[PDB]
Design a protein around this ligand. Structure first.
Ligand code: NI
Length: 407
């Protein structure tokens, strides 16, 4: 309803420096940003307050598959290991697996995530209950136009959850241009275009994908907001026409290395004006859902080519503001009228010294373990605890689920 937190360093956005102050929050939004010492309800002196993070690509229930598919090529990973397990993944498991995904993500300062999966209504219930924001999409695939009812399920999800509490939006999730036929992909973009909804898709993830992007550009990509995960093998000849359309790349560095796909040319894309964001992918191919780790790794991989690549401000912009923009939320900046999606970082740690270079440490030294995360003016993680759920009951159900799923 109404509070003032702070009396500590505040980092308003990716482009500025920390200043001592406080933040006034009312009804899930930032009412005022104060400078200097002021009377506050929650004193966080010795800490840093900054905008929360936004993960643009994940499959939340895959936390239940963390570490089950190691040392395999992508085709083996998907058809030999993953699919047989997904066949046994229940609605209840989707729910708890995403409560677990949120518990992990909140510890890393994430306020919202884009999901592409199944049993999405149960995933939505977990997001509702836990407190994060989410752009939820149903994974879509077909065989000659027969999608087994997947788009219909995505439409039911949209009917029931789109817009929920200003926290959940629904989009459509065709898996990729190779698991979706051309006619069906056109049908999906047509649907998203009619509903003014976004589309997310795995695009040029592997080197085997050599289709022309004109095919997709001609069926809706220019008019539908699209979060294209990976883009590792996206041909450079297309960078120029991808700049002025609502096309957002979701860069998933750890997954790309782990599955032997390589390194996306993020620096060249940004140089051509493309919008780039960061995603973690699922827990079976990353293995963590930590966007600070993804951001740091992304910076390092581009620096391998030139140490001046992906500077600190650009990295901080991608994980906060850019990701919130891809998801359609007014977050990413501690400014009057913006969402109260904030993160609290402990500065009394060895890796946060010298104090003079805190922003640099956030990108190149910080553990990624935040002190607290707030979404829509509500604490969803605070000093090791999860105020919105019964952690012990969740732990007991997850232990039962591990036995049940892997007998
Ligand atoms: Ni993925």
């Amino acid at each position: 309803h109404h509070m003032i937190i702070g009396n500590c360093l505040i980092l308003k956005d990716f482009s500025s420096e920390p200043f001592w102050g406080a933040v006034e929050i009312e009804n899930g939004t930032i009412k005022r940003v104060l400078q200097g010492e002021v009377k506050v309800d929650l004193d966080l002196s010795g800490k840093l307050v900054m905008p929360a993070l936004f993960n643009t690509h994940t499959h939340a229930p895959m936390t239940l598959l963390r570490g089950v598919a190691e040392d395999l090529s992508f085709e083996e990973w998907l058809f030999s290991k993953v699919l047989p397990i997904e066949d046994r993944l229940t609605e209840k498991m989707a729910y708890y697996g995403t409560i677990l995904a949120q518990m992990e993500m909140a510890r890393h300062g994430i306020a919202g995530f884009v999901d592409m999966y199944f049993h999405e209504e149960w995933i939505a219930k977990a997001v509702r209950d836990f407190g994060m924001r989410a752009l939820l999409t149903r994974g879509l695939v077909d065989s000659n136009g027969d999608d087994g009812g997947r788009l219909e399920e995505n439409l039911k999800l949209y009917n029931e959850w789109n817009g929920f509490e200003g926290r959940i939006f629904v989009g459509f999730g065709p898996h990729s241009p190779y698991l979706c036929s051309e006619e069906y992909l056109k049908r999906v973009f047509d649907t998203a275009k009619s509903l003014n909804a976004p589309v997310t898709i795995h695009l040029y993830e592997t080197s085997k994908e050599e289709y022309d992007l004109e095919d997709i550009l001609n069926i809706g990509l220019k008019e539908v907001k699209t979060i294209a995960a990976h883009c590792v093998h996206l041909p450079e000849r297309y960078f120029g026409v991808l700049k002025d359309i609502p096309f957002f790349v979701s860069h998933n560095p750890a997954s790309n290395l782990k599955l032997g796909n390589g390194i996306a040319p993020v620096q060249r894309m940004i140089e051509h004006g493309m919008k780039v964001t960061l995603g973690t992918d699922g827990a079976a191919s990353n293995n963590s859902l930590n966007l600070f780790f993804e951001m740091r790794l992304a910076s390092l991989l581009q620096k391998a080519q030139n140490p001046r690549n992906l500077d600190v401000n650009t990295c901080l912009k991608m994980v906060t503001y850019d990701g919130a923009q891809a998801m359609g939320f007014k977050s990413g900046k501690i400014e009057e009228g913006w969402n109260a999606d904030l993160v609290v970082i402990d500065l009394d740690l060895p890796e946060m010294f010298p104090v003079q270079n805190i922003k640099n440490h956030l990108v190149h030294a910080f553990s990624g373990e935040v002190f607290a995360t707030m979404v829509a003016g509500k604490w969803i993680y605070f000093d090791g605890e999860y105020p919105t759920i019964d952690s012990e009951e969740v732990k007991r159900e997850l232990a039962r689920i591990e036995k049940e799923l892997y007998s």
